[PDB]
């Protein structure tokens, strides 16, 4: 259920991933990516602008 909602909110980065227990690593890696690299870089750019 919750992976299917993460799919709904997602914006293209999880098109190659289903909602079964097999795909959990993809979701976890995406969350780690957002927490580590993408989010702080985007926030730095936004705060600079």
């Amino acid at each position: 259920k919750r992976m299917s909602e993460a799919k709904r909110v997602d914006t293209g980065a999880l098109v190659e991933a289903g909602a079964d227990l097999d795909d959990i690593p993809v979701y976890l890696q995406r969350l780690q990516e957002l927490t580590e690299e993408a989010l702080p870089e985007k926030l730095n750019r936004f705060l600079d602008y």
Partner: protein
């Protein structure tokens, strides 16, 4: 009393509804407008039971039917869907195109826009399934008719001067794991019925 949606938003959403989908490759000035105000576009499309579908990784936008507070039904039963339901022989070509698309995307990266394929490369592919009529003209006509019918759905452009087509990125969202699993489940039941 009178309150109007911003003219830019009206123009962008009307174009989006007209073509069913919108890309940054062809219409950046509208794609950026739509992606910058997704809440307004979603609330504009909500009355028609339509919703936006965003993909920044590929610069794509497409409208899709809704089911909230009107569950089940059928996505193609919606009154405003103007085109017929997808046809099995078309789905076979869709699968082949998606396979080429995943190959090209995994070898190039998602940023590049030229997910092309040559027409001559598909004819052998279809020969295995649809059979061989012994006439290059007949099979080429068959393939071009299928590609046109897919263009009606927006998954492919028409052949260019070099007999090459561009697989529109919308295909990646049409055939993704959630839908491929359902298609496989349906096809296995069809085969079991054939037994």
């Amino acid at each position: 009393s009178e309150t109007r949606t911003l003219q830019k938003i009206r123009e962008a959403t009307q174009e989006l509804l007209k073509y069913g989908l919108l890309e940054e490759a062809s219409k950046p000035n509208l794609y950026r407008i739509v992606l910058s105000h997704p809440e307004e576009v979603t609330r504009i499309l909500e009355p028609l039971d339509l919703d936006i579908g965003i993909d920044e990784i590929r610069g794509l936008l497409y409208v899709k039917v809704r089911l909230d507070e009107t569950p089940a039904q059928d996505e193609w039963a919606h009154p405003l869907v103007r085109r017929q339901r997808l046809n099995l022989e078309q789905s076979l070509l869709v699968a082949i195109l998606r396979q080429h698309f995943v190959a090209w995307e995994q070898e190039s990266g998602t940023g590049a826009s030229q997910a092309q394929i040559a027409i001559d490369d598909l004819l052998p592919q279809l020969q295995i399934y649809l059979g061989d009529p012994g006439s290059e003209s007949k099979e080429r006509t068959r393939l071009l008719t299928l590609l046109d019918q897919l263009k009606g759905h927006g998954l492919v452009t028409s052949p260019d001067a070099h007999e090459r087509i561009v697989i529109r990125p919308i295909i990646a969202h049409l055939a993704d794991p959630i839908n491929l699993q359902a298609l496989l489940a349906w096809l296995r039941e069809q085969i079991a019925q054939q037994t």
